[PDB]
Amino acid sequence: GSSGSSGDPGERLYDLNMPAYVKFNYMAEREDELSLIKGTKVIVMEKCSDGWWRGSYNGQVGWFPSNYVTEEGDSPLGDHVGSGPSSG
């Protein structure tokens, strides 16, 4: 008894909102791509298994190479984090 919706390997991960750190300034050319800056922080929203990531920078949004950024991560000071990973 199950619901066969995605009969394929892997999964689509989006709306993550994971804070990343631009280790290398990326130069975008297409409106779809985003220009990253070494020494800043972005917010990853989507992730393409291939390797390309999709986040925001200063209100902007586009595609950028994850190899340039790094998952900095930030924990909520005070009470242990909770909202996010939902499982049973």
Q: State the CATH number of the domain containing residue 66.
A: 2.30.30.40
| Residue pair 34/63 in contact by the 8 Å Cβ criterion | yes
Rg for the chain, CA atoms, rounded: 15
Q: What CA–CA distance (Å, rounded) separates 78 from 66?
A: 30
| Residue pair 17/43 in contact by the 8 Å Cβ criterion | yes
Q: Classify the C-alpha dihedral 54-24-28-49 as positive or negative.
A: negative
When divided into structural domains, the chain yields a total of 1
Q: Which of 35, 21, 24 is nearest to 73 (CA)?
A: 21
Q: Which domain holds residue 25?
A: 1-88
